[PDB]
Amino acid sequence: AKKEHVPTWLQNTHVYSWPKNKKNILLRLLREEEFVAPPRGPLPTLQVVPL
Amino acid sequence: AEEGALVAAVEPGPLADGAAVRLALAGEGEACPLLGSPGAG
């Protein structure tokens, strides 16, 4: 296949290539993301210094 | 009549000074993210 063979309405999502992206296909089926972001921390402590 | 008036020098009396205020961020670091899952045959 190629890029164009995808129906247009399906081009608005992720397109996986077999067998190149088989791990990504597995992840998508598991409903799990490849990247996991770190938990959001607190805003940095703001220190004041004179000059 | 030379005693009519006198010349005067003007100065700014109540002068004041102060220091500039600069901001800084305390501490720094970075927690690593997680990624990956195994392929299969």
Say yes or no: A43 contacts chain B, CB-CB below 8 A. no
Q: For residue A24, what is the enclosing H or E element?
A: helix A22-30
Q: Based on the number of CB atoms within 10 Å of its own CB, is A16 exposed (0-12), middle (13-18) or buried (19 or more)? A: middle
Q: Which of A17, A12, A24 is nearest to A1 (CA)?
A: A17
Report the C-alpha gap between A45 and B28 in whole angstroms.
10
Evaluate whether A50 touches B24 at the Cβ level (below 8 Å): no
* Chain A residues in contact with B24 (beta carbon < 8 A): 46-49
| 8 Å CB contact of A38 and B36 | no
Which experimental approach was used here? cryo-EM
Report the C-alpha gap between A18 and A10 in whole angstroms.
16
Evaluate whether A32 touches B34 at the Cβ level (below 8 Å): no
| 8 Å CB contact of A34 and B20 | no
Q: DSSP 3-state assignment of A51?
A: coil
**Structure-token pair, residue B14:** 């109540």
* Chain A residues in contact with B34 (beta carbon < 8 A): 35-36
Q: What's the reported resolution, in angstroms, to a tenth? A: 3.0
Report the C-alpha gap between B2 and A51 in whole angstroms.
53
CA atoms within 13 A on the CB side of B26: 7
